[model samples]
Target chain A: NFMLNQPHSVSESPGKTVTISCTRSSGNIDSNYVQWYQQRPGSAPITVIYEDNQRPSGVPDRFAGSIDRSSNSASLTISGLKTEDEADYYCQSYDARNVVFGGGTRLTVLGQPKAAPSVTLFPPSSEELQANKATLVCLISDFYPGAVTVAWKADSSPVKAGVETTTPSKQSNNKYAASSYLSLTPEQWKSHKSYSCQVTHEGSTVEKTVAPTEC
Target chain B: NFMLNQPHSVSESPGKTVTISCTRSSGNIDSNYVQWYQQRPGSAPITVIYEDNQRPSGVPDRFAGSIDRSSNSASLTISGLKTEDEADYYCQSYDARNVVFGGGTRLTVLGQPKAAPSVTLFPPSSEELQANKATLVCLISDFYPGAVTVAWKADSSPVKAGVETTTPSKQSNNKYAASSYLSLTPEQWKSHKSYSCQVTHEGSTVEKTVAPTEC
Candidate 1:
């Protein structure tokens, strides 16, 4: 077992320059192609830096990452943090044996950012939708691949043994996206408070919530 | 500018338990209460853990966490992995000054498990509901709110923009459900190869792909 350790936590805000360091117990990480991730509440993750500044796929141009070949350390810089930039960030590395991850750094997009982007929850706006078990959908748009992360949360509590999710696909904008579905019962639906769709991109993030409104 | 980090990556598989560790630098994290988060491609993150082990308000239980305070560290362990665990995972702490994070970890759930309980992905029926946008939805019977992520991929490429999503509502069966939208133009719909719906719930995730016909 390897004792890959890092900072337990760190915090920063918009307009501030923040940094995260990732180091290994052995070997040099200069050639290992390190990566960084960002995740805001109720959203997925996005890749900010890869291969030490090479840009893995469709990450944002603003998020910058660099590595120290000699000390086996890496750092990420968020020039000007946005409310959406309020979330968690992570540093990562690979060595053929297994995927190594540093301790995660949470970023709190303090300003209450916005009231959350809302979406349709039921009746499908069509007779066809209600006819079925009522499929609640969640989506995440604009990602940097390997940068976005998604999850399903129900009624303020993490639903255990009753949720299925999807994959992260890249788009023409050089971003990433994906979705998922779940078949729940009426009681569960009634008790449900918020349907969470979370994302974690490189620098910032976007999140939308669905409240089960009875029609 | 501040610097932070994450537990793992944006993508991991389902049914597989994921563990995130948090260490410290010059400072000590031994006395801090670490938290976690989940974010989709274009959404904010949601609380998964707090006060070291207790989840915050509106956070779920399947999304568990643990800490190795001795080394000034924390951890989030997810089980039963699903497609929904695709979003990012974060480690948080109360900075006393504010809040802080290590970084973020995004888990991607890939493929299906063929042993034990035999997890599964529910595929919605395919219908040429519209001329341009052929709606395709995948469903998971009941996989809990473990820590999942979902995303879409067309022709093996990711979709960057034009995505509509729904919230994961609570069902009567005491289960929670979630999903997303792919309102593509007719050309984009027709040429769509295989679209995958991923899940990364509490470290357990699965990425299930579906096509027009498969739906």
Candidate 2:
């Protein structure tokens, strides 16, 4: 297996410039064609550069990809960045038989105020209950910086199975929203009697709880 | 609104070649950049070509994109095809301000046998009933041609609300599977006493029924 390494995080202000680097571990940086992908929260990754440095249509010229042989690394540069350009960037390349992707680099747009999320929990719908599956939804909205941790508990005990949490997505007002789901069988839900969703943002935590009797 | 017209369906044998065309109804076909996307059952669309004729990395060289000024159209040509290439193809292009997508074209690989799906119905799980919602699942498997229609009935009457059906997806055995869901309130499910799932494929219909007590 090949390894592509990248920084964990980077930051820049709107209208400024930033560069993220991806370094190759065992091969010459230019031996294989390198591609870059941009992924926003709650969305699938989109190709930004293919065949090393070629930008896709609809992408602005402010984004550029390049390789440095001396450093054995590839770089993605963004100039005159917009707030929307804040996202995770990943670099990918292939060996003779295997494909490798770098650990993604998160690009944060500075100057946005840090805010906590408002948490809300919803029990399974009538339709879901009728279908014999109970799904709990926890909505986290109005958060800033777009990073949060979510966890679920049943009857005050940590729960691990059938849980799904989404990345924070930007809203029209520049705030962020995310969702988490917990799925349970009717028998398990009834026996547990209580469920809670907890969200932690910037060292602070917020929680919402639900019970079978509440529905 | 502008329109991009394409054939409703196209077919060819494996290892052969096929071309799908997207004819623009207005504006010069080459004035703006055109992109092509491929979507399989139950999956998001992915770009095969961007900027008219540029293929994205990871896509095989057998797929080519071109623009023809004479026909005012764009084309996606696939050569040395395989059964996995069966999917829907869509063409997209931007005008000065708006983006338009063609009506998708279905590509079918010939030589595969047509088979009927085996139908099965499942009542909502006990967890769902305890949560006050009920959902019924109709599973249709072992089908071919990847096309079918699914309908739901409650007490022999057509159901219109809280119903969802997924596109048929290829299974490991090269057959297809799809699912349809019907949701109800616990009270409605208990009161109705009967629900049925009907699947129609290539002029034949298979059905399965369930009741509240079936659980």
After superposition, the stretches of candidate 2 with alpha carbons farther than 4 Å from their true spots are A3-34, A37-47, A50-59, A64-90, A94-215, B1-11, B14-108, B170-174
Model 2 residue A138 CA deviation (Å) reads: 19
**Tens-digit per-residue lDDT, B1-215, candidate 2:** 35788898999998999999999988789888888888665333577888899887899899999999988999999999888788889887765434566777889998977888766566665655677767676656668888899888999999988765554557544677655656588887898868888999999988777776633
Error of 1 at B172 (Å): 5.5
Taking the tens digit of each residue's C-alpha lDDT, what string does model 1 give over A71-163? 878888776766556556777665443345666776543333222221212212122234434455554445433334445567555656554
Lowest summed lDDT across 10 adjacent residues in model 1 chain B is found at B114-123
Interface RMSD values for all candidates:
13.3, 12.8
DockQ each candidate and list the results. Answer: 0.04, 0.04
Leading candidate by lDDT: 2
**Model 2 chain A poorest 10 in a row by lDDT:** A164-173
Interface RMSD of candidate number 2: 12.8
Which prediction has the highest TM-score against the true structure? 2
